[PDB]
Amino acid sequence: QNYGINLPITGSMDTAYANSTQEETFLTSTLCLYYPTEAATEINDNSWKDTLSQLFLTKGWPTGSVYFKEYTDIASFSVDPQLYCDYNVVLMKYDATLQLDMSELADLILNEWLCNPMDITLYYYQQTDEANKWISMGSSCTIKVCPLNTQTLGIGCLTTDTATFEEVATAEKLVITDVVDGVNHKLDVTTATCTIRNCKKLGPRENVAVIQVGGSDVLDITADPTTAPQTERMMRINWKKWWQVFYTVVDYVNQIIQAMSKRSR
Amino acid sequence: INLPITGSMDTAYANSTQEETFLTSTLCLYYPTEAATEINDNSWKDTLSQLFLTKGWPTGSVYFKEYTDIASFSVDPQLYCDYNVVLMKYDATLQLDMSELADLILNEWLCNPMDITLYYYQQTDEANKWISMGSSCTIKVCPLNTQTLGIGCLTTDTATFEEVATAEKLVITDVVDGVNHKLDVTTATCTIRNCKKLGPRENVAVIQVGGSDVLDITADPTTAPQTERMMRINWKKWWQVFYTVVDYVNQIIQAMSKRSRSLNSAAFYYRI
Amino acid sequence: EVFEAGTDGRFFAYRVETFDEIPFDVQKFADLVTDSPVISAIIDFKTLK
Amino acid sequence: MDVLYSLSKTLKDARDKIVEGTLYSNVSDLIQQFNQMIITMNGNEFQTGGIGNLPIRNWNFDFGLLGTTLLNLDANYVETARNTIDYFVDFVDNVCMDEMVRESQRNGIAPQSDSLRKLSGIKFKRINFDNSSEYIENWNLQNRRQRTGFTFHKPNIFPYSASFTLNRSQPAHDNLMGTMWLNAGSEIQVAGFDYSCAINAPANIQQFEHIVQLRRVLTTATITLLPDAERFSFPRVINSADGATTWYFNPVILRPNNVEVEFLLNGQIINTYQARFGTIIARNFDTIRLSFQLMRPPNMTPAVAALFPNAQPFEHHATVGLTLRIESAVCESVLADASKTMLANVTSVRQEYAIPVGPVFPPGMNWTDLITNYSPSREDNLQRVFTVASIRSMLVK
Amino acid sequence: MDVLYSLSKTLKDARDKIVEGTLYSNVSDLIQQFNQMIITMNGNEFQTGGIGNLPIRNWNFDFGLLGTTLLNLDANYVETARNTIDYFVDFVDNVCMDEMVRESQRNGIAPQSDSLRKLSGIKFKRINFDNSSEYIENWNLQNRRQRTGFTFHKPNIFPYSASFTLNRSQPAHDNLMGTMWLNAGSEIQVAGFDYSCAINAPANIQQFEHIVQLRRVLTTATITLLPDAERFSFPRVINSADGATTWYFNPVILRPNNVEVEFLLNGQIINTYQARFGTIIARNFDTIRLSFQLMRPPNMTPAVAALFPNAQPFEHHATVGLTLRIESAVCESVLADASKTMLANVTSVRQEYAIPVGPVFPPGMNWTDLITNYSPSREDNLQRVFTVASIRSMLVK
Amino acid sequence: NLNDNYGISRQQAFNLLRSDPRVLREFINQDNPIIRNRIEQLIMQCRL
Numbered sequence A: 001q002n003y004g005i006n007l008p009i010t011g012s013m014d015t016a017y018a019n020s021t022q023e024e025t026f027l028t029s030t031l032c033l034y035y036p037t038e039a040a041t042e043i044n045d046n047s048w049k050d051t052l053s054q055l056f057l058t059k060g061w062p063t064g065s066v067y068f069k070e071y072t073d074i075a076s077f078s079v080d081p082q083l084y085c086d087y088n089v090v091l092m093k094y095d096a097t098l099q100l101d102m103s104e105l106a107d108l109i110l111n112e113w114l115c116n117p118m119d120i121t122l123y124y125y126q127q128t129d130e131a132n133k134w135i136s137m138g139s140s141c142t143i144k145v146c147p148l149n150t151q152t153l154g155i156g157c158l159t160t161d162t163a164t165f166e167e168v169a170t171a172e173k174l175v176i177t178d179v180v181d182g183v184n185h186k187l188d189v190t191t192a193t194c195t196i197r198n199c200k201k202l203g204p205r206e207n208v209a210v211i212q213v214g215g216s217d218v219l220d221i222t223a224d225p226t227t228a229p230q231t232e233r234m235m236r237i238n239w240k241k242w243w244q245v246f247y248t249v250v251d252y253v254n255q256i257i258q259a260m261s262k263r264s265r
Numbered sequence B: 001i002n003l004p005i006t007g008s009m010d011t012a013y014a015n016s017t018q019e020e021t022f023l024t025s026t027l028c029l030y031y032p033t034e035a036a037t038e039i040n041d042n043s044w045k046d047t048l049s050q051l052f053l054t055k056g057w058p059t060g061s062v063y064f065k066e067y068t069d070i071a072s073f074s075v076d077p078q079l080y081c082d083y084n085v086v087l088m089k090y091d092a093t094l095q096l097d098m099s100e101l102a103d104l105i106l107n108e109w110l111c112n113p114m115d116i117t118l119y120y121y122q123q124t125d126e127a128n129k130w131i132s133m134g135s136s137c138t139i140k141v142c143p144l145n146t147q148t149l150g151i152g153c154l155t156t157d158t159a160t161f162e163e164v165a166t167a168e169k170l171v172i173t174d175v176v177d178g179v180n181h182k183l184d185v186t187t188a189t190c191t192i193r194n195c196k197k198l199g200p201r202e203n204v205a206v207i208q209v210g211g212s213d214v215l216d217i218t219a220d221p222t223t224a225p226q227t228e229r230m231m232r233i234n235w236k237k238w239w240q241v242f243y244t245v246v247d248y249v250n251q252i253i254q255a256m257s258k259r260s261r262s263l264n265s266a267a268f269y270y271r272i
Numbered sequence C: 001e002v003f004e005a006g007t008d009g010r011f012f013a014y015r016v017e018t019f020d021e022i023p024f025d026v027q028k029f030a031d032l033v034t035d036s037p038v039i040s041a042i043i044d045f046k047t048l049k
Numbered sequence D, E: 001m002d003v004l005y006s007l008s009k010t011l012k013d014a015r016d017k018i019v020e021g022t023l024y025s026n027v028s029d030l031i032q033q034f035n036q037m038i039i040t041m042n043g044n045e046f047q048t049g050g051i052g053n054l055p056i057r058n059w060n061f062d063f064g065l066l067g068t069t070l071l072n073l074d075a076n077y078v079e080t081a082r083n084t085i086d087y088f089v090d091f092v093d094n095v096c097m098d099e100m101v102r103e104s105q106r107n108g109i110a111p112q113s114d115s116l117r118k119l120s121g122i123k124f125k126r127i128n129f130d131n132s133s134e135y136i137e138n139w140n141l142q143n144r145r146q147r148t149g150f151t152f153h154k155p156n157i158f159p160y161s162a163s164f165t166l167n168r169s170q171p172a173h174d175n176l177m178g179t180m181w182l183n184a185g186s187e188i189q190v191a192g193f194d195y196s197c198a199i200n201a202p203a204n205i206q207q208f209e210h211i212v213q214l215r216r217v218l219t220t221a222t223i224t225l226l227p228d229a230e231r232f233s234f235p236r237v238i239n240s241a242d243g244a245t246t247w248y249f250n251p252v253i254l255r256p257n258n259v260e261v262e263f264l265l266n267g268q269i270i271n272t273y274q275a276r277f278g279t280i281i282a283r284n285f286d287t288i289r290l291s292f293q294l295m296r297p298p299n300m301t302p303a304v305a306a307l308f309p310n311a312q313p314f315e316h317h318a319t320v321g322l323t324l325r326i327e328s329a330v331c332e333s334v335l336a337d338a339s340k341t342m343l344a345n346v347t348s349v350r351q352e353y354a355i356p357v358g359p360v361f362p363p364g365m366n367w368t369d370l371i372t373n374y375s376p377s378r379e380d381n382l383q384r385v386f387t388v389a390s391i392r393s394m395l396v397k
Numbered sequence F: 001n002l003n004d005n006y007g008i009s010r011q012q013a014f015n016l017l018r019s020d021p022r023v024l025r026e027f028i029n030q031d032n033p034i035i036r037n038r039i040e041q042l043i044m045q046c047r048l
């Protein structure tokens, strides 16, 4: 059990495919859904959770392995999302005005970020690679940046007059900022109501699954404007009600969990 | 990983992994408000940064996270740094608090939630404890017998329950391992979790700024150990304490080792 | 054994006493030109012969 | 054994040379050898078989000699010679079948099939005619210790081994680095794959090495090396080590750079080849080291830049391959090939007469598990059965 | 080679037997042998040397016979005989020093040092007197292939390896499990160490296995198996595999329980010993499997209980050891020992005369790299040089 | 040690005496431990 190390693995091509770990992973794992308040609002039923649980019970998932966790709105969810389960599903409504925020949410939860803190009053920060971004959470973040030159002086901005800084956010609950990698930036931030963290995007999180409910696929996880990929756990649906959506999820929960895979870290 | 590792005793190998990360370390101090109070300066953080720069740590690697009180810090301590140092003042009326904080941060915990009402829980081994965090946690416990009745207590009258925590923010409760207990906790103001102790956290280092060594990290009274990352200092000012820490940070860093299990921000893992 | 070379992409291997071309041996000319003293081709093989 | 090969060779040369119309000048020496063999045999009674479905046969030799008075041969002589040769041919074939099926760890070179011992006695030594064949020659050499050699064409020296090795793995198998090899018979196909095309690795390069450690030495190997191995160059769905989950593999073949093929003997490097593909030679080697690299192209056109992004999805996996075939070689020991049928005759005899599993050979003589542990006992018994199989094949095909 | 040994033996026996006053009835046969040697040698010119700093010498034998007329030898006879013998002794020493240096991958048994090729002729075969010594007897036998064997006291068959293996590791190296071993010469000192003392393990038991795979099969080995390995029983500061960092090792010895020693052959088991110590025997083995355990004491005193707590610090690491020393043994092949100076003579000659490195033996003939790869060519050449070394040491010690 | 174990030619010996980089690096590429050890020791002595 050599943890903290990475060793060469080996195998063969003559070994046969083993049994189906389904009907056991459901029992020794847990499934957490994240629905919006609009769903329960439209529904207007108190026993819909027990109903979906008794339905899951047919697919194999036992009674107390399923969890439902409401969220009033996509931004309130983006505010410190704490996903601690063994299989997470996230039903996400589409709004053309919220596109960037509901893509930042995806880039935050679908992936696994290694996040170090940040202190703006003392230091001036720079990015090193293309995956070392700055994610800001809080209730209203107003972020301004002033890049510096080789000799610690601004570029189109002054290091005293914060009004001359360059604005990238304006009262956003979640922000993910990428800047030019190789230049030191001086920052202004609403530290009182927002925390900023310098995070490196590691390999992806195979434990969550986003399901867009409405419009066409728009989520550009990769900040670089060349890939625009569609990952396997990035699902779309077209909706007019919510019971049909929940029945679809329950009937196709095995494909979802096949698209997902228990975490590594 | 299950596979094995090999070695030797004659070689001088020199062949080893080289890679990159956040810029070759990070460090975070946790100092009490009293220190900045005594100092009365608004440039001492930058002063200490430029000092650490002599020891090698670059500008954007050292951080300070002020904490008002030991209890406030114990309430949801969110450590996310590659090296953590915790300066901690001595107070004989707080021994259990600043030993529970140590047993929480120095050791690595795997915690599952708990539903007091619908269920009655128990401990399996000598490492499965119950940690409760919040603003004021008053806990009461009634052991049970084979026939699901009480023992010196009554399932109905909460006053008959036996008290173990009174007006505490962090509590680490160990009860008899192998019996079902019924609990009463201020669930409105505190959250209790069934936690299991794992291999230690080599990423934090406690520094008792004051009196003699008291921290009994191990709840069992027979060990009373003292780890390499459990330090002591004698103090009359805070500038001298910080200069000492800075002059001897390379030994602190030789005593601390980066994590092995995974990355996480809190003092315990969640596994439902 | 003399190994010549030029930036214009010519390469002649020959002998010292009786100038007579020979197949050019890369992976030997390189290990020689690395360390062994190198000489200018003012009297290059064509004119030399 | 030498006298067995002598019997088989003079019987072959008798069925061939002794034909109607031919001339006694061409066959007088062979006829004298035949008559000497008959004189030696006559009066001895042999037994054969008694293992599995081999029947127990008793041979009694009382024959007449062959005349030497004629100049040209007639049918009245060929008929006698044929009636006298068929019996000896059946006897030698039955002895060879009785000997190919017996095993022993104690002195596997010494003969089993006790009739063959009796022939290895010192009265039957007047039968030797010529020990010319390669197998009997190397047998006599080994008895009179000398540097032998069997020249093999496409030798089956590698046991079938298809397998992979992952040096950077995950549960979801979405960013992998590793090497995959199929070592089969006389050929090897190795291939190193990286799903990131060496974007994070240093200098935009990733190193792959495969060390094949042969069980027996080889010499004068003529080898054909090529890039871009085939069977690891198309989409695949492979199970993990524990056979629990599967992972996909969609390759994109590049060329191996910094390629180095090292033929070693006792760890001492012997032959080295750098960036040379085609027909190469190895003079003495017990180990092969194939060490290649995967180099990210620094300049890329759009159609290939769209395949190697700086993000984890990586639906195209960069690969570099090498194929290596040992077309011909020489070995101081005995193996199987694509030219000779000695192994097939042995295994066919055993499968036909239903011999139980022996202490030495595995069941069915699976060359994989019989080369995997090429111990000296197995090597001796294999030389022996191969020799008598060649001897039998010289008579019955 | 037989004639070289015969020369050496009859010169030895001439320097021993022929002394003033002795009786011709005791040395008549040896005098006839010496005179025949002189006759066979008279008229030949030998050359010796030509490699490294070894000089080039020319020998021309024209001596006179030894009188068969006397009854009691006198000093005027012994003096002439010794004047004759010292030349032959210098010639034989020089031939042996010419032959111990040369090598060949093709027919290493076939002589080198062409004076010895000349002595291999059929006009020199009349010199043979007797071949009784162990090495020459095994030489003649292995040529006339038979079941041979050399007897060894404390043989050097294990190549020097001092290494460990961790089945549970961390970067801090505070809770480990693994096995350490020193395999050197005739001794194997192995030690399985667990820092937790098998508290988190099932049944309070932790297993360890150590598999040694010899390159040549031994026989009739007398072995001493003791517990509590010594050189893995004191504090240590050992480096990681990758050399990055180090770790402390403070051992505390415990007995190995349910111990097992399996002496195997081609994967099959031959001998098995359970909970036996002291002197043991092994009739044949190519592989040794030591299997031992660490059993946490169910009962414990205050001190040892305070040394083995249920928490991670673990400042006293439990260990279980085994020393295994091969005292005597027997082997079909040739090795080194702690009794014989053959390897020492060979290496001393090569080092003295600055012999360039050859195709077969490793540089300087370091027994570690010579037994880690003991291929048949190396085996043959080593047997040859060891035999001529024994010969040279029968004369000059 | 080198002349004894790795038997050495006259030219190689003269050039090693003269401390010739050509033959020194020919050995260091021949992977001669008797020289690689000395050179690694020069490193471990040229550290500071």
Ligand SMILES: *[C@@H]1O[C@H](CO)[C@@H](O)[C@H](O)[C@H]1NC(C)=O
Pocket (backbone or CB within 6 Å): A018, A019
């Ligand atoms: C594997 O699956 C087969 C087919 O359903 C089943 O017969 C077998 O019992 C399974 N293996 C085990 C260990 O149960």
Ligand SMILES: *[C@@H]1O[C@H](CO)[C@@H](O)[C@H](O)[C@H]1NC(C)=O
Pocket (backbone or CB within 6 Å): B013, B014, B015
């Ligand atoms: C490390 O490198 C040295 C020289 O490059 C080499 O001799 C040694 O074998 C390497 N280590 C291993 C374990 O191969």
Ligand SMILES: [Ca+2]
Pocket (backbone or CB within 6 Å): A100, A101, A102, A104, A172, A173, A174, A175, A176
């Ligand atoms: Ca946003």
Ligand SMILES: [Ca+2]
Pocket (backbone or CB within 6 Å): A127, A129, A130, A131, A132, A133, A178, A179, A180, A181
């Ligand atoms: Ca960037």
Ligand SMILES: [Ca+2]
Pocket (backbone or CB within 6 Å): A156, A157, A164, A165, A166
């Ligand atoms: Ca501006």
Ligand SMILES: [Ca+2]
Pocket (backbone or CB within 6 Å): B096, B097, B100, B168, B169, B170, B171, B172
């Ligand atoms: Ca407390």
Ligand SMILES: [Ca+2]
Pocket (backbone or CB within 6 Å): B152, B153, B159, B160, B161, B162
């Ligand atoms: Ca009570």
Ligand SMILES: [Ca+2]
Pocket (backbone or CB within 6 Å): B123, B125, B126, B127, B128, B129, B174, B175, B176, B177
């Ligand atoms: Ca407990």
